[PDB]
Amino acid sequence: LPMVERQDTDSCLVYGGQQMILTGQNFTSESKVVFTEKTTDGQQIWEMEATVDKDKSQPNMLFVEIPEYRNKHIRTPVKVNFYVINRKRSQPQHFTYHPV
Amino acid sequence: GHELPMVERQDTDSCLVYGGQQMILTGQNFTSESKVVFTEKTTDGQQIWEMEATVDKDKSQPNMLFVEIPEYRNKHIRTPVKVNFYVINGKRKRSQPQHFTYHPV
C-alpha cells in the first residue's frame, strides 16, 4: 500500500503550480496523486489529479505539482486532502490553500 | 473492514483543557466499534498520555464520528499543549495521527 511519511509543503496560494515532495514507501512508476475535498457530512465537492514527475520519482519519493484550487476567489484558507494511489490508496494527507 | 480507518477532516482543532465539547470527524471506514484515542508524546516521540474519547454511537456513520473531546490530563497548564488523536478499528488498524491543541484556562 502506498504510505506517505512526510511532505515538504503544507500550503500554498490558490493558484497552485509549485512542487511538493512526498517521502514514504511503496510508490511506483504508476503512482498517482489526487487532491480531494469533502464537506463535514462527507460529500466530496472537489477532486483533481496532480501531475507527477515520473522521471524524478522513486519508490520513496514523489515529485508532485500542486493543483490549482477549485475556487481561486476564496477569501479565507481552505483545508483539503490528497492521496497517493497505486484504488489501492494511502491514508489522506492534509494541505491548505490560501487566498491571493 | 480491511482498509484502515481514515480521517479527512475534523471540525475542531483546539479547545480549552476542560474538554467535553463535541468534535466531528469526517472520513472513511468507520464502524460501530471504531474507537478514538487521544495521545501526547515527548519531543523524541514517545507516548506519555493516552485517553479514549467517548464516541456517540447513536450518531455514527461510516464516514462520520461524533466524539466527546477528553479533558486534558492537567488543567493547570499555562501554555498550549499539542496532542494527537487517532481512530482505531479492532486491535491494530489505526488512522495516522491527527493534530489537536489544548489551551489553558
The CATH number of the domain holding residue A20 is 2.60.40.10
Cβ within 8 Å, pair A40-B9: yes
Chain B interface includes A41 (CB < 8 A)? yes
Say if residues B30 and B5 touch (Cβ distance below 8 Å): yes
Q: Given B4, B9, B63, which is nearest A91 (Cβ)?
A: B4
Give the list of residues 6+ apart from residue B92 with CB closer than 8 angstroms, or none: none
Chain A hits for B9, Cβ within 8 Å: 38, 40, 79, 81
SS (H, E, C) chain A: CCEEEEECCCEEECCCCCEEEEEEECCCCCCEEEEEEECCCCCEEEEEEECECCCCCECCEEEEECCCCCCCCCCCCEEEEEEEECCCECCCEEEEEECC
Beta strands A93-98 and A44-50 are unpaired
Q: How would you list the strands of the sheet with A61-65, edge to edge?
A: A3-7, A19-25, A61-65
Interface contact flag, B64 A40, Cβ < 8 Å = yes
Residue of chain A minimizing CA distance to B29: A91
- Grid cell for residue B41: 508524546
Chain A residues near residue B97 by CB distance under 8 angstroms: none
How many Å apart are CA A2 and CA B78, to the nearest integer?
40
Structural domain contains residue B43 = yes
**Strand duo A11-13 + A44-50: pairing:** unpaired
Chains A, B: CB pairs < 8 Å: 29
Nearest to A84 by CA among A29, A46, A38: A29
Q: What is the DSSP letter of B40?
A: E
Q: A43 — contact with chain B (CB < 8 Å)? A: no
For chain A, the straight-line distance linking the first and the last C-alpha, in angstroms and rounded, comes to 36
Q: Which residues of B touch A96 (CB under 8 A)?
A: none
Q: Does B33 touch chain A (CB under 8 A)?
A: no
Residue B12 lies in a domain: yes
- How many structural domains comprise chain B? 1
Tell whether A92 lies on the interface with B, counting CB pairs under 8 A.
yes
Rounded distance, CA B16 to CA B105, Å?
A: 7
A58 within 8 A of A65, measured Cβ to Cβ? no
To the nearest whole angstrom, how far is the Cα of B60 from the nearest Cα of chain A? 11
3-state secondary structure of B8: strand
- B1 found inside a domain: no
Pairing of strands A93-98, A11-13: parallel
- The reply to whether B98 falls in a domain is yes
| Distance from C-alpha of A1 to C-alpha of B4, rounded to nearest angstrom | 11
Hey, is B39 helix, strand or coil? strand
Residue A93 CB-half CA count within 13 A: 26
DSSP conformation letters of B51-97: EEEPB-TTT-BTTEEEEEPPPPS-TT-SS-EEEEEEEEETTTEEPPP
The closest alpha carbon to B4, from B70, B104, B97, B80, belongs to: B97
Give me the domain span that covers residue B18: 6-103
Ramachandran region, residue B76 (left: φ > 0; alpha: ψ -120 to 50; beta: rest): alpha
Would strands A32-38 and A44-50 be described as parallel, antiparallel, or unpaired?
antiparallel
Across the interface, whether the CB atoms of A40 and B24 are under 8 A apart is answered yes
Structure-determination approach? X-ray
The strand pairing partners of A80, in sequence order, are: A95
Is residue B91 situated within a structural domain? yes
Rounded-to-integer distance, Cα A41 and Cα A43, Å: 6
For B44-71, b where at least 16 C-beta lie within 10 A, e where not — what string?
Answer: eeeeeeebebebeeeebeebbbbbebbe
